[model samples]
Structures are given as C-alpha cells and as structure tokens.
Target: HMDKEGFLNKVREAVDVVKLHIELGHTIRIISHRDADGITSAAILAKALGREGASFHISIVKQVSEDLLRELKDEDYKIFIFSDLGSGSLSLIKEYLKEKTVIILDHHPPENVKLEEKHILVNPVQFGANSVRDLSGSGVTYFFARELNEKNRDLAYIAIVGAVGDMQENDGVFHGMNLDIIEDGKSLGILEVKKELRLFGRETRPLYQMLAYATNPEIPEVTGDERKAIEWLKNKGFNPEKKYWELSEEEKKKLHDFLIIHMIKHGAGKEDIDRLIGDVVISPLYPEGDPRHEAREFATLLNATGRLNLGNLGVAVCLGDEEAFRKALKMVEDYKREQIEARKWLLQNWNSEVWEGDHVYVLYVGKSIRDTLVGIAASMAINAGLADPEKPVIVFADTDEDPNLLKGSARTTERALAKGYNLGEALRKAAELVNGEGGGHAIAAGIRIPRARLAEFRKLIDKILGEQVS
Candidate 1:
C-alpha cells in the first residue's frame, strides 16, 4: 500500500532537516534498540555521520522508557535520533525532548503522536507501508544515510543484514523497499543473492551442528542429536567434517536430494521443504573461512551481541573494527551454546514448564531461562513443532534485574495469523488489563507483566486470543 516514491521523498525531506542540524554544529545523540536491526542502524549512522564530520554519541538499549528519556532530558545534546524504536513512544519523545530537534528513523508501528515542525518521524508504517514486510530499522537508517551522502549507498549491504535479522525477508526473498535496497547492494557488488540451503548457520556452523540446530523444517531424529546427524552424514558417504560451501556441485546436489527425500519421509510439508532451499544473501566482505562472510551468520553474530548486552560490540563489527570482530566471535560461541542449552531445557521440562490452554500455550521458565533467551526459546518451540500450530505460544521468564516483573514474548504460526490473531494487539490489551505494558508486530509481540497477576493476565490473554478466531 505504500508508494515507494513518496516514501523515499519523505526520507529525503527528513535528511534535509538532519543536515541542517549538522550544519549548525549540533552534537547528535543516537538511541537505538538492542537488536541486529537497531545495531546496524546505529552503525550506518555512525559511519555516515563520521564521514560528514559530525559529532555524535550513541546508546543501544533494550527499549526506551520515560525514565530513560528523563535522564536524556538532563543532558545538553541538541539533536536526538532514535532508530528501530520511538515509533511506539513518540508521545513520550515529544513531551521529553520538546525543546530539541528529534528524528525518529524506525519501522515499528507508529503510535498516535503528532509532532511539532522541528521533529520528524520516518516510519514507513506512518506512510501506509507494512512494517513487517516493507522495511526494518536499518533500512530506514540506510535510506537516510544514503540521502545524507550518496557514498553511503555502499552501506546498503548492512541494511540487508538488518532486514534479514528482523526476518523481513518473506521466505528468504526481500519485498517492498527492502528489495530496492537489495538491488542497490547487488549492483554495488556488496551482496550476492542465490538459492542455497536455508539453514541458520551456513558459514559458521559445521555440518553436524547445522543439522543438529535445524528447527525450521526440523529433521526428525536427526535434529537436536549431533551424534545422529554425524552418523546420518557418514552413512550417506559424506564427510561430517566438511562445510557445505566447500562441496562440489554434484556432491552438493546429491546431498540436497538425500536431505529433501529424508525430510519428506519424516513428514515435512511442501511449504517447509520449499523453505529448505531458497534465496540467501551472501556478503563477500569477509574471507571464505570467516562466518561474517554470510549475511545470515553476520546477523546471528549481531543478534548475539545485542542479546548478551554487548550491542556496541556489534556496532563496532559492522563499522569494520577488527578487535571488536574478534571479541564478537567469542560471544557467538557463548550465545549459540546458550541457545542449545535453552532448547535442551525446554525439551527436558516440556510437561512441567508449559501450560496448554484452549487458545494458547503459556510457558513459564522462572529464572532458569534468561529473560533475553525466552523469546528465542518460544520461537524455537514453535519452529520445532513442540507447540500447537493452531495456537500462539507465549513464553515468560523472571527478570534478573527486576524481581517483581516477568519478561514475556509470544509467537504465532501462519495458521494462527490467518485466523486474524494479532499477538501485539492482544498482548497490549491483555497487559494493559493487568496494569502492564506490551506491543509489537502481529506475528511476534512481547509483554512486561507483574509476576503476582500472572493468573489474571493469562485468563485475559486467553479470552482475547479466543475472540480472535475467524
């Protein structure tokens, strides 16, 4: 529904405002979310502004709150640029940063906030574009960066990394303005697109680890079992130590054939099978043995940096810092191991940890699963088919920093989405009913609810989800 020309024009106008601030010698304060998309956004702006000889201070956070804004209000920074977030808290930004020049480059759904002439919100959703399909935080920042300087077009690949990290690619293919950005990257030789095996870790993961961690279209008996995966590869006359990218054409085809047949025999659907081989965005920036050579691997690397509260490390890597990249490699190992353990724990405590309701699956991992990992765990459960596809899966974990509250995340299947279920709307309303807060995309949303009122929150969410059925 978005007019691409209009969207670009709006971004151009906003860039003009930002340039005026830079010309006037304003020190910009950049605030962003702690995710791949936001981290890449910050990196793009950092590189772009640095090239333009602008002074800026950047901070990546979990999310923005009134308390955080009040602290910023005390600072003397004249320009505030929020990426990936701020759309949902535009009113708060308007109130707290009223005297300063504020620019919000986000892709989340815009809240009902009308800003003054000095402020700008560059969210595609506000321009009638789909936030989930059209753009991401880095995509917005990339466009702004490009308009700030044409040389920033080379940064298009980072935008694709952010979109891929946000899962904006529909079945491995980009859409809307995201496709436009990908085209720029491909033309500039910054990215290569191809139909390849669509596993989580292509360059970083070894053959067995790749198979063992395959949740989407999961291979029965082979997935989650490294020994079984190695045996299966060895029995099929393939080397378990070899990487997929190192294989010859014929050998790759043969392996692909066997895997497809095996997946079909193990009950994977046609759609899931199709997903196994789709477009992959490849980056030639890193060397062959380097994991960052693949955009998917790089996204995971950035995601690990954010989830572990080391988002600045991700920004540094994106900006091409060697020392930061070395440190990030270590975080990837720790993050991957953490995810593997989360999966194991979920499987081990399946019955005891999960509550299967009529309309949803609620999981409570009190203090065992880190609050940050709970969302990924919910996604893993749904992808691995451990939860009912007809219902949404909601996961909650006790926050280490806040004992009175529980961090919650929810994910829904295509089937549930088809029934008109919006997790963001439902969770937001349900959370509000319990005097909490929540909002996100329709398919994936989150909440911060009082731990004591969990029973009431659960019943209300169940009622809301039940009412969403077509």
Candidate 2:
C-alpha cells in the first residue's frame, strides 16, 4: 500500500527517531521475536547502535508470556525496542514497567489495545498501506536503522534477508510496503535484486521431504503418483544452486509448455495451470542473501534458536559478537538434528483424533515440544493434508511448570484473512472467552490459557471457527 517514495520517507523518519534516542544516551533493550524476522531486526538495530558507540541487550522470545514479562521486570533499561511483536503486548508490557520508554517497529497488525503515549507503535495499517502482507519484523527495524543513520545503507541488505526469511520475497516479487522497502534498498545499492530460482538444498531438504510426506491429493479419487515428484526433479538435473532460472530461454519455454500440458492432463483449470507455470518460472528469482556468511545464515540459525533455548545466542549474533555466532552455529546444528528426530516422533505418534474435524484441524502437544518446533510441526501437518492451509491450525501445548498457561500458535493463510477471519482478533476473543490472556497478528497469532481451562478453550476455538466460517 506504500509507494516507493512513501516507504522511503517512512524509512527516513524511523532512522531519525533512533538517532534521537541514541543522542540522549538511553540504554536500549531490544526484544525481538525468536524467528528469522526477529533475528534480522535485532541485527539491523545492533548495526545501527554500533555506529553510536552504544550496544543493546537483546532477547529473543518464542511467544510473549507472563514468564517473559516477569523476566523483563528484573531488567532495567531506558529504551525498550520490540521488533515483530509488542503492538499486541503493549498494554501488558506497560503494566509491568510503569515508567519505561518503548519504541515498537513491526509489520503485524495492531491488536487489542489503544496506544499509550509512552509507546511508539509502527505498523503498515496505521499508515493506510496495503500492498503486501508479508513484511517481516526485520523490514520495519531496518527502516529505523536507515532513518537513524543514512550511512547504514548496508543494513538494508539485511532487511531484505529477513524478508526472504519470512518468505515475503517469494517468487521474485515483493508486495505491499515490502516492495517499497526493497526498492529503497535497491536504489541505494544496499540490496542487489536478481532473478534466480531457489532450489532446495540439503539444508532445506527436510522441507521438501516433509512436504512429500504430508501431501494428500485434493482429488484423491483421481490421484497421481506423488512419488514421481522426486524423480522429476532428478530428471531435470536440478541441482540446488542450478534452479529453473538457469535454464536457457528455450529450455524454460519448453518446460513451461510441458508443465501446462501436465496440468491439463491432471484436470487443472487454466488459472491453476497458469499459476503453476508462473511459480515454476519465477520462484527461483526470489531475492535472497548468499548463504555462505553468518549474517546471511542468521534466519535459519535463529529459527533453530527460537525452537530451542538458545535465543541468547541469537541476541549475541545480532550484537556482532564473533563468539556468539560460533556458539550459535554449533547450537543451531544440534537443534536442527534434534528437530529431525522430533519430526520423526511426530510422524510416528500423530493422532488423528486430536486433529479430526469437518472444517478444522487442531494439534495439541505438551509444552516440552511446544516452543521447540511447533511451527515446523504445524507446517508439516498442513502440507500432508492433515490440516488445511486455508484454515487456521491451532497448536496447543501445556506449559505446566508455568501452570494456568497453555500456548496456542495459529497459522492461517492470506485467503483466510479475506474471509473476515483475523487470527489476532480471534486470539483476543478466545482469551476473553476462556478468561485467560492472548493476542497476535491477523494471519498468525498466539494465546495463553490456564491449563485448567483446556476444555473451555477448545469450545471457544470451535465457536470462533463457527463464526468465521459462517
């Protein structure tokens, strides 16, 4: 919804704000989501702070909870910078810190509360923008950095990296304000826009494997050989780095034509076929950072950190500390290995009863695996057809040690949003229904409920779905 010029001006304003705060010598505490967006945002802020001879204390939180709030209560900092999150938790955070200055840079929609003077909340919706829906937290944080230091142009590349991590730059295009930011970065030469295909490598091998395992044909009565997908890739000589974009123009046209034929043979509509052709031809050209460097690898690494308890390592890496990056690499590798094992466990132990519904799928697990890799689990389930991507997947994990607490993660499609279903609002409603606390963005969000209220929470979820579908 933001044009190139408007987004650039916003970036300029954000940077100026950061610079003003830095000039006042305020100690900054940056709390970011423990995902790619969060890590990238932290990195951009850290880089900006580096210029002022100041540093921030960074924390990566999986989901905002009272325990996290309790932890923050013990820390003393003048400025609290929350990236990717905070718009929802503003009131709760403010209740705990009666006299703290908070600045939030985020792309998620504003949730339940009215903004207080002490907090500065930045989101695209506040500015009447609607071009794309996937700008990650790092994109917003980068604007702050750019506004703070015009010389901080290099950080824009990191912002684009975060956008790629969030899949906002998928298929070689940016939508919404995301395109605006990308253009700003491109104009400044901080970001290099290239057309290339992103082929899954060994690192992303699990994603494809999981997809294969989870894919259930929509029209099962006339199913095709899904196993052939792997063979198809092999036959195409598609190496990880050698994607569809590397094909000659003739080859590209031939493949495109052949794919259209294949889709027609499979009974796909013209629109569906065209979409497939576009995705195949243009997906590889998605903007992404070279994966060879630590900074570039931060997204994947931080995903692991968030799943595990190595969030501190993510914060350290954002601070540009070599020791932290090295430690994170080892931690990330170990965590990824554990995730593979976790995936296997999930596949072996998946209970259809837990997710069965005519219109929805719910996966409830213990809190132990809740923050560990619930997102991956939800994604795997959706891919396999155990859950519908167009519908929200509700993941419930019992955090008993912190009893009176159940964490819920919702992953819904953009299509769902168009249907008047906002996950953030749904979470807030759900929390109120169950007499608990919860909030998040439109398409994806989280909530917390008392363990004792599990049954009531389930009923609340069903009610919310009923309203959405009706």
Candidate 3:
C-alpha cells in the first residue's frame, strides 16, 4: 500500500518533472483512454497545464494499439503524457518513442518493462496499491494536479466522477485513495454522499422501468418482467408513476428492504446487497434537472460520450461545455437503445452450447457479437446476478479491429475476489502463455489473442478457475 509520505514524494517528483519540461517550453501531448476516467484525466491535466500557460495537445483512444503508437511516433512532440492507459503497453511505447520523454499516469497493471531514465511510470499499482479499489486513472492524474497547485483540488469532483465512472465504487462504497479523492470533493462542497439505490436514472427513470431494469442485484420477481415489477409495486400501495426521488421516505425504505430480501433469497451475498444500497455521490455542477448532477449518472454520460465515438464531446463536457452536455444526452439515448438490443440478443444466446464449464461461465460469441458489445453483454450478465458470483465470468468474440485476433473480457464479484481471484493477473499470464497480451484491474480486464488459439486459451483459463496461482 501507499503510505502518505511515499505517495506525496512521488506526486512531487511527477509534478516537478512536468514542471521542468514546461519551463523549457517543450510541447506535450496527452494520450488518454476514451472512457470516463480517460476524459477526466485529459481534462484535469489540460486545466492544470493551461493554468501554467503550457502548450499541449490531447487525444483519446479506446486502447493502446500498435497503430496508435505509430501515429504518436510520427508526431513531433517533446513529451508524451499517457493517462489511464500506457502502463500495460509500456514497452511498446518506449520502443516506439525511442529517446523520447514519456510519462504514464495510469491505474492498469503494467507489463514487465525496463524503463529508460526519461520514461516515468507513475501508476499506483507499482507502489503496492490495488488499481481496482485504491485509485483510478483520474485519481492518479488528480494527485499530480494537486502538486501543480492547491487550487486544483477544486477538480477533485472531476476525479471522483472519473472513479465512479470506472466503477471503483463497485463494492458499494469508496474507500482508500479513492475515498480520499471523494473527501476532497466533499470538502470543496462539490459533492455529497448518501446511501441510495444504485440504479440507472434513479431520479428520472419511471419507477417500473427502474425496477424492471435493476441489474446489480436483479430482483427475482421484478427484474426482466415489466408487468410483474409494476404489479408488485402497485400491490404494495406504491404509485407506479413515482420516480425514485419522488418516493416517500417510508416507501423508499420499504422498497429497499424488499429488494434486499429478494437478492439474498436469490443467492446474493449480504455484501451484494450492500453494493445495491450504498454510498453515492451527488455532483452539483450539472444542475438538478440534469442526470449528470449525480456522480454515477454523470460517469455514465461520460462513458456514453466516448463509446458512441464522440470522445471529443465528452472531454468538452468535462471542461464545462454546455453544448457538449446536450450532445452527450443524445448519445446516452442511442447507447441505451443499443444496449437494449444487445441484451435481447444476449438473453437468447446463452444456450447449453454457449454455457460451458462449472467453475466459470464462459461465453464464446466469436463472430456473432461485436467485440465492443461483447464485453457489455458479459458485464451486464454479471451485474444482473445471472452468473455465479462466486465464479469469474469470461467472454470472447472476434475483434472488430482485426479479424485474425480475439477479444477477451473478464469480470468478477467481490465474493470471488476474496477467493484469491485476480482476473488482471490471471489473464495477463494466461494471455502470455497463448502468445497474446492482456492487462487490467482486479475485477475487469480485456485481452487480445490469436483466434486460432482460443480453444487453448479457454482450456488454460479453465485449469485455474478463480485461483491466481498455478
């Protein structure tokens, strides 16, 4: 773990390094992920550098691909600053950026790379910190931003939103380094915490749709069946028209306790219920009418902004763009619609042929599902409590970027984590054994493998189940 002194020293070093380059008037380029955390990383650093009157260019990518590195190699920039990505592809970047100064402020697991003197890897994972729970990509960026100036603490809200976007609060609460970031936002009066139902569009979603779409701990009699969810609520003397925020305190408590019983009866651990009704941050910047006013919802909007191929708009929203907010709202609408279509396709495909193995639920969609949506299908299944929470879930499909390669996604619950399951490390080593590459945080990860070796990859992963070691 990162003690206060060590973390502070590292932050000082990171800030000083950036300051030196800026003082020399060297142009910097920021290459970040396209997700919520990535957008926030770009925003935080952009704002900090803007304050110092530095010249820097920022770009977003879904992942660090060899193609992306080639593009960077052609750019004439003095410094390459990678946020939220680059650690896993550290060596690739180092080799491509030969003799170039590069800084990586990310939270993902890194490859075993021999860093040159000018290449700085500032990921908290190397500092004995858990990337999944302790800190997020934006959290790392915010730490360096704080060293740039105390006023940057105002940007703590951005960091917290990024962490929430990354699902660092998946355990139902935020603690450790993440909590510290949240506390900073709280101190700035930009954030407030409460225990509430962790549902999409809680404040605006129709009560019936909210209940029917509740996936984290899918209500047995309610979720997936609209009429049943509505009938059950109506029979309980609850108004079906009421939005989540419109419900009375007693009614909300009644529904909360009711869902807990259903989740537990359906094999969900108490911790699972904890994750359902737990700490939530309220963001005040987006205005009350806007769903982005809440941290979780805001994070979703940020993600939709990127997933819909409008990452530039997402970054604009992060930097307080009113117009971008409207564009993001529309993007979220289309994204949800696509998710619904994907869900319909997913529910029909988990036949006996697709559902194989006992220890882990493996779905090989192959060419049937796009790689982008394949991971979503797997994640939604896990979130809906459809998979055995005790076992990790894995999914693979033909990659959209390359037909010769396979895309792999893995997800696990906190229960599985205590069983010494580390999906990131497990996939990392497993991918290497199969002549592929992968790296991610504990609960989630993605890998690229040769399509021909998928069967061997599955056999290899099956041998381990959820265990981290051989």
TM-score of each model, in listed order: 0.96, 0.78, 0.93
Q: Over the stretch 390-419, how does candidate 1's per-residue lDDT look in tens digits?
A: 689999999767889999999876778888
Ranking, TM-score, top scorer first: 1, 3, 2
For model 1, what is the error of residue 449's alpha carbon versus the real structure, in angstroms, after optimal superposition? Answer: 1.7
Evaluated at residue 196, the lDDT of candidate 3 is: 84
For model 3, state the Cα shift of residue 170 in Å.
1.0
User: Candidate 3 lDDT (Cα, whole model)?
Assistant: 0.80
The reply for model 1, stretches above 4 Å from the true place, is none
Clash number for every model?
Answer: 0, 14, 0
**Candidate with the larger TM-score of 1 and 3:** 1
Q: Where does the lowest 10-residue lDDT sum fall in candidate 2? A: 214-223
In model 2, what lDDT does residue 119 have?
65
The deviation in Å at residue 215 for candidate 1 is 2.0
Across 1-470, the per-residue lDDT of candidate 3 in tens digits comes to: 56755766777877888898999998788999988989999999988898899998888887888778888888888788999999888888888987688888998988886988788788787777877878888999999898889889888888988888887887788866888888888888988887888877765567888888766656666777779888988887787767877777788889888778777787766666778888878876656547767777787788888886777788888888889988788877767677776666667777643545545677887776667666677777776655777777888888877888988888887777777778887788888799888888777888888999877887777676545633
TM-score of 2: 0.78
